[PDB]
Structure formats: structure tokens, C-alpha cells
From Swiss-Prot:
Member of the two-component regulatory system NtrB/NtrC, which controls expression of the nitrogen-regulated (ntr) genes in response to nitrogen limitation. Phosphorylated NtrC binds directly to DNA and stimulates the formation of open promoter-sigma54-RNA polymerase complexes. The gene is glnG. The chain holds residues 1 to 124 of 469 of the full protein. This is DNA-binding transcriptional regulator NtrC. Residues 5-119 form the Response regulatory domain. The modification 4-aspartylphosphate is found at residue 54. Phosphorylated and dephosphorylated by NtrB.
Amino acid sequence: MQRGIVWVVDDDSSIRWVLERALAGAGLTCTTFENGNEVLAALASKTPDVLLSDIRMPGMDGLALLKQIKQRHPMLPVIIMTAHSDLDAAVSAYQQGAFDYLPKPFDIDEAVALVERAISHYQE
């Protein structure tokens, strides 16, 4: 079947576009929102393939809506970039989680695709 649906969360408008642009050549459904909140506001029902989150943001902090993302849709495969101040929202990974840390560098399809397989790999 191939194809996938990655709903990642960036920081502000014009950021979700940039990605989806490099994600168009691949031909995937890389939906990106501005805030981790609004993100689960659209997935309120349940993520499609895998959720993701960057480590950038305005000022200090680093997306405090991470623990939110999970609280909504089940713990389906996800992926949070490295980050320097996210370690807090990440700590909730080893504790019954389904996503590790993504370091650099990584291509757009290299990332998206990679997940596409995970999502349908360990289902035992």
C-alpha cells in the first residue's frame, strides 16, 4: 500500500508549509500544525499514522503540549526531535510510550517513510 499520514507539530504558520513542501515530492500526508494543542484539536478523534514534534519555538520553553498529544489519541507511534528543553515532555516516553528521540541529520522522506514502516512493524 505504501503512503502514510504524519501529523507533526511545528511552531508558527509558514513552518508546516515548508515541510509539506519537501513532503509533496515524496507524496505523503505530512499534516503539520502550529501548536501541539491545536494539533490534537484536529486529531481529537485519533492520529492517522504517526505524530511528530520539532524542538524549535518562540522564546524559551519547547512545545509544552507534548504530554497533551498523547493524553488525546492513544500512544500510537510518534517521534520528538532531540531538543534541549523538551527532556521534560519526553520523560513520558520510557513510561509506557511509543516514540524515541530523533537526532540529526534526517531527510524528510527518510524520517516520514521510516515511520511509515514502524507504524506497521511491531504490532504483536
